Design an enzyme around this catalytic site. Structure first.
Site, PDB file in Angstrom:
ATOM      1  N   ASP A  72      -1.933   0.512  12.717  1.00  0.00           N
ATOM      2  CA  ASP A  72      -3.014   1.051  13.338  1.00  0.00           C
ATOM      3  C   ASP A  72      -4.018   0.135  14.170  1.00  0.00           C
ATOM      4  O   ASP A  72      -3.992   0.229  15.372  1.00  0.00           O
ATOM      5  CB  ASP A  72      -3.941   1.962  12.436  1.00  0.00           C
ATOM      6  CG  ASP A  72      -3.196   2.878  11.536  1.00  0.00           C
ATOM      7  OD1 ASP A  72      -2.261   3.542  11.941  1.00  0.00           O
ATOM      8  OD2 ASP A  72      -3.746   3.235  10.446  1.00  0.00           O
ATOM      9  N   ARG A 110       0.751  -1.029  -0.003  1.00  0.00           N
ATOM     10  CA  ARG A 110      -0.018   0.033   0.015  1.00  0.00           C
ATOM     11  C   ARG A 110       0.896   1.176  -0.320  1.00  0.00           C
ATOM     12  O   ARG A 110       1.833   1.362   0.832  1.00  0.00           O
ATOM     13  CB  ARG A 110      -0.880  -0.130   1.322  1.00  0.00           C
ATOM     14  CG  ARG A 110       0.167   0.066   2.637  1.00  0.00           C
ATOM     15  CD  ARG A 110      -0.212   1.150   3.466  1.00  0.00           C
ATOM     16  NE  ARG A 110       0.468   1.525   4.622  1.00  0.00           N
ATOM     17  CZ  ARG A 110       1.550   2.210   4.556  1.00  0.00           C
ATOM     18  NH1 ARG A 110       2.277   2.242   3.906  1.00  0.00           N
ATOM     19  NH2 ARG A 110       1.983   2.365   5.807  1.00  0.00           N
TER      20      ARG A 110
HETATM   21  N1  LIG Z   1       2.705 -10.074   6.074  1.00  0.00           N
HETATM   22  C1  LIG Z   1       2.092 -10.359   7.175  1.00  0.00           C
HETATM   23  N2  LIG Z   1       1.683 -11.339   7.914  1.00  0.00           N
HETATM   24  C2  LIG Z   1       1.061 -11.432   8.911  1.00  0.00           C
HETATM   25  N3  LIG Z   1       1.018 -10.403   9.840  1.00  0.00           N
HETATM   26  C3  LIG Z   1       1.258  -9.235   9.256  1.00  0.00           C
HETATM   27  C4  LIG Z   1       2.070  -9.006   8.227  1.00  0.00           C
HETATM   28  N4  LIG Z   1       2.276  -7.766   7.720  1.00  0.00           N
HETATM   29  C5  LIG Z   1       1.686  -6.830   8.828  1.00  0.00           C
HETATM   30  N5  LIG Z   1       1.407  -7.911   9.831  1.00  0.00           N
HETATM   31  C6  LIG Z   1       0.950  -7.451  11.148  1.00  0.00           C
HETATM   32  O1  LIG Z   1       0.803  -6.202  11.244  1.00  0.00           O
HETATM   33  C7  LIG Z   1       1.647  -5.733  12.251  1.00  0.00           C
HETATM   34  C8  LIG Z   1       2.084  -4.411  11.765  1.00  0.00           C
HETATM   35  O2  LIG Z   1       2.964  -4.264  10.713  1.00  0.00           O
HETATM   36  P1  LIG Z   1       3.663  -2.987  10.157  1.00  0.00           P
HETATM   37  O3  LIG Z   1       3.758  -2.338  11.238  1.00  0.00           O
HETATM   38  O4  LIG Z   1       4.481  -3.681   9.181  1.00  0.00           O
HETATM   39  O5  LIG Z   1       2.227  -2.503   9.408  1.00  0.00           O
HETATM   40  P2  LIG Z   1       1.915  -1.275   8.253  1.00  0.00           P
HETATM   41  O6  LIG Z   1       3.501  -0.261   8.732  1.00  0.00           O
HETATM   42  O7  LIG Z   1       1.654  -1.509   7.079  1.00  0.00           O
HETATM   43  C9  LIG Z   1       0.114  -0.517   8.254  1.00  0.00           C
HETATM   44  P3  LIG Z   1      -0.380   0.908   7.699  1.00  0.00           P
HETATM   45  O8  LIG Z   1      -0.944   0.860   6.425  1.00  0.00           O
HETATM   46  O9  LIG Z   1      -0.975   1.415   9.196  1.00  0.00           O
HETATM   47  O10 LIG Z   1       0.427   2.299   7.766  1.00  0.00           O
HETATM   48  C10 LIG Z   1       2.531  -6.781  12.493  1.00  0.00           C
HETATM   49  O11 LIG Z   1       3.084  -6.497  13.789  1.00  0.00           O
HETATM   50  C11 LIG Z   1       1.589  -8.093  12.270  1.00  0.00           C
HETATM   51  O12 LIG Z   1       0.850  -8.433  13.339  1.00  0.00           O
HETATM   52  N1  LIG Z   2      -0.609  12.203   7.269  1.00  0.00           N
HETATM   53  C1  LIG Z   2      -1.710  11.362   7.834  1.00  0.00           C
HETATM   54  N2  LIG Z   2      -2.166  11.801   9.017  1.00  0.00           N
HETATM   55  C2  LIG Z   2      -2.805  10.787   9.571  1.00  0.00           C
HETATM   56  N3  LIG Z   2      -3.228   9.469   8.892  1.00  0.00           N
HETATM   57  C3  LIG Z   2      -2.772   9.327   7.916  1.00  0.00           C
HETATM   58  C4  LIG Z   2      -1.878  10.494   7.140  1.00  0.00           C
HETATM   59  N4  LIG Z   2      -1.504   9.514   6.077  1.00  0.00           N
HETATM   60  C5  LIG Z   2      -2.315   8.462   5.917  1.00  0.00           C
HETATM   61  N5  LIG Z   2      -2.895   8.255   7.156  1.00  0.00           N
HETATM   62  C6  LIG Z   2      -3.802   7.154   7.205  1.00  0.00           C
HETATM   63  O1  LIG Z   2      -2.852   6.142   7.597  1.00  0.00           O
HETATM   64  C7  LIG Z   2      -3.714   4.910   7.706  1.00  0.00           C
HETATM   65  C8  LIG Z   2      -2.943   3.536   7.134  1.00  0.00           C
HETATM   66  O2  LIG Z   2      -2.056   3.462   8.406  1.00  0.00           O
HETATM   67  C9  LIG Z   2      -4.702   5.144   6.559  1.00  0.00           C
HETATM   68  O3  LIG Z   2      -6.106   5.064   6.873  1.00  0.00           O
HETATM   69  C10 LIG Z   2      -4.694   6.785   6.113  1.00  0.00           C
HETATM   70  O4  LIG Z   2      -5.905   7.461   6.311  1.00  0.00           O
END
Ligand SMILES: Nc1ncnc2c1ncn2[C@@H]1O[C@H](COP(=O)(O)OP(=O)(O)CP(=O)(O)O)[C@@H](O)[C@H]1O
Ligand SMILES: Nc1ncnc2c1ncn2[C@@H]1O[C@H](CO)[C@@H](O)[C@H]1O
Ligand SMILES: [Cl-]
Ligand SMILES: [Mg+2]
EC number: 2.7.1.20
Length: 331
Positions: free
Chosen positions: A291, A126
């Protein structure tokens, strides 16, 4: 008490769409990154319609508090403040919070639009491109302490620093003077680590629990000293350091979560907890995984569970979210 967790954040609407790599290239985006839209990228919002996107509430801290409220159930179990624009989009976010039972005090910024984030899914990753809009005018009201009265867990995302670091500083300040209260912070994204170095430094001193992913800590190591997994994690705990809760939680996709805590005697305890395997073909999108993890973690912490238990709850919430489109709610 009624209100268990209080958070501040940027309420935004997410527009999700699966796009080809060519789209990323035309928009100058790096796969998997999170950034704020530059003038040239503003055109991404209207152009997404050709991909039949879906829309759903977003906002990092909002997503997190919504998990806590859903698990606690009682009205006002979680509280949240942020700024929305005076538009139909802002109304949708507001209506959704009311229907979920969250306690909120949204500030409305007339003349400005509700923030929006384009969540571009490509391959499995993403990419986030956001336009803050009204979120940038957010200012905590003078009586926010009254609205959050009774809460012992305060949370802020580094993404709130763009509007102004004063908001998060005021929250941390308040929590600090309250015994049995803790201030928690999320590094949010590399850009926040690199752009708000000073504010973050003052903030870290008053932080009890710091959350972030490997990428964010890496930048935090560089921006600061420590440099260097485990070391980076133990490293960051000094920034919070120099029994009062001091813990750092580092998430890293499918790799084990690493948590390092500093006990009263100065003893350092580090936990390496595995994350249950999820077949790739079962993953929809990982938007909101962190999150959801923070939300499950805070809910469990609210119930007095142990650090390892906290982590397991966060992992379970995140595993559910990655099997859905955007930030879903289920369990
Ligand atoms: N490929 C995968 N398989 C299993 N669990 C996963 C995974 N990727 C992420 N996770 C789960 O999600 C948690 C957080 O992962 P990470 O911090 O890398 O997410 P993020 O950084 O994509 C999400 P966002 O879209 O909020 O920014 C991990 O601790 C795990 O529990
Ligand atoms: N600048 C930002 N402040 C707060 N939330 C954000 C920001 N950019 C992306 N997000 C949120 O982060 C989420 C993924 O962690 C999405 O739901 C998106 O809305
Ligand atoms: Cl946020
Ligand atoms: Mg990820």
């Amino acid at each position: 008490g009624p209100m268990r967790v209080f958070a501040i954040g940027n309420p935004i609407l997410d527009l999700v769409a699966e796009v080809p790599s060519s789209f990323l290239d035309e928009f100058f985006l790096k796969r998997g990154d999170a950034t704020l839209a530059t003038p040239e990228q503003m055109r991404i919002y209207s152009t997404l319609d050709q991909f039949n996107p879906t829309s759903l509430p977003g906002g990092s801290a909002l997503n997190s508090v919504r998990v806590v409220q859903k698990l606690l159930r009682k009205p006002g179990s979680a509280g949240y403040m942020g700024a929305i624009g005076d538009d139909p989009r802002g109304q949708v976010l507001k209506e959704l919070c009311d229907k979920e039972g969250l306690a909120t005090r949204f500030m409305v910024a007339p003349g400005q639009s509700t923030g929006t984030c384009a969540v571009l899914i490509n391959e499995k990753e993403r990419t986030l491109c956001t336009h803050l809009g009204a979120c940038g005018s957010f200012r905590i009201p003078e009586n926010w302490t009254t609205f959050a009265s009774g809460a012992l867990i305060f949370y802020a995302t580094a993404y709130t620093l763009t509007a102004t670091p004063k908001n998060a500083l005021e929250v941390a300040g308040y929590a600090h003077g309250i015994p049995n209260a803790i201030f928690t912070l999320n590094l949010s994204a590399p850009f926040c680590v690199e752009l708000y170095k000073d504010a973050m430094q003052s903030l870290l001193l008053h932080t009890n629990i710091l959350f972030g992913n490997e990428e964010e800590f890496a930048h935090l190591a560089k921006v600061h000293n420590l440099v260097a997994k485990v070391a980076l994690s133990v490293a960051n705990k000094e920034h919070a350091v120099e029994g009062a809760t001091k813990l750092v939680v580092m998430t890293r996709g499918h790799n084990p979560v690493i948590a390092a805590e500093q006990t009263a005697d100065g003893t350092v305890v580090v936990h390496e907890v595995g994350v249950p395997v999820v077949a790739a073909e079962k993953i929809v999108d990982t938007n909101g995984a962190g999150d959801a993890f923070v939300g499950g973690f805070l809910y469990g912490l609210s119930q007095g569970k142990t650090v390892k238990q906290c982590i397991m709850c966060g992992n379970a919430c995140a595993q559910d979210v990655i099997q859905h489109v955007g930030f879903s709610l289920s369990f």
